Amino acid sequence: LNPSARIMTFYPTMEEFRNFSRYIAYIESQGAHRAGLAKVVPPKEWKPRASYDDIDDLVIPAPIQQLVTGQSGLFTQYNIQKKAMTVREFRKIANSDKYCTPRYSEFEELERKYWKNLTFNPPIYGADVNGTLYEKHVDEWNIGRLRTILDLVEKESGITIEGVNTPYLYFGMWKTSFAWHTEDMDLYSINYLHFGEPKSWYSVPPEHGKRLERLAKGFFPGSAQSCEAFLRHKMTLISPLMLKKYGIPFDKVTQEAGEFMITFPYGYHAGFNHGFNCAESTNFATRRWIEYGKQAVLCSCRKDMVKISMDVFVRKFQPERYKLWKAGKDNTVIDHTLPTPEAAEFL
């Protein structure tokens, strides 16, 4: 089942598209999860919003200027918070001569310019904005209400974790980046590109994720000594030439407007935006995730870092392992190749 662990793309019909969780179980039955990242092209009939002509006055309250320091394919990104600005104000800066996408032929050419110019002319990313651009009545793949077992957190506790069980928007310009990371608590993510220029992605198969972490620790041994989970700080940029040079398997994919990407538990990903765009994202879970959450290596050294109590999940879905887990004796090893139990339907 996807033995190459390559990024797969799916084209669901509207009947297949309707049940979100059941379609994630399906793509896993096809091996999609082995790559760490999958693309889903929604049916042509489906639109999450009638038009995006009305969002220019939307406030980006904490835009980030992205200062990148480094060389030889290894970089640290320092996110400087700027004053609030509207989407109109942001698009003007994005599309300006100073910040707009360079001219280019093939994607590989734009990819080279990004890795060459990453540390110059720091861009502004309208990142981590609370909100959704879904119209209230869109019932299929609505990032505001996906209906997965991750809803157990708020249902049980009342706790909302912004961007994790609530939606975030990302207004990009050229050369804006997301550093190497897995999701908080090693969850899944969903990412829909509402409009604009593409978003390109790098992915490491979950089954080789530990190899990426070992490599990253050797390259940033200071950071590793102060925090086991330093990649969770979302500051570490590593080029695909460095991954290739140190034998880390990875794939790349470019997401276009109107496409979803799905990241899988313990799937390391990074990337960049090609130009002015807008993506929406949130996290979600399947039953397969519960073990990932139990075993997630968490960031020690920072306040406001995302932690989820696994108790409720182990009680409900692994009641036989509860007392053993609670006693610290649960030695389950994760097999990254296995699809979620909900996939049994298709297998």
């Binding site: 981590d128 406001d304 932690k307």
Partner: peptide, 11 residues
Amino acid sequence: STGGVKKPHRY
């Protein structure tokens, strides 16, 4: 435990 925010600390 539960809590936090996904938005990483800005500088």
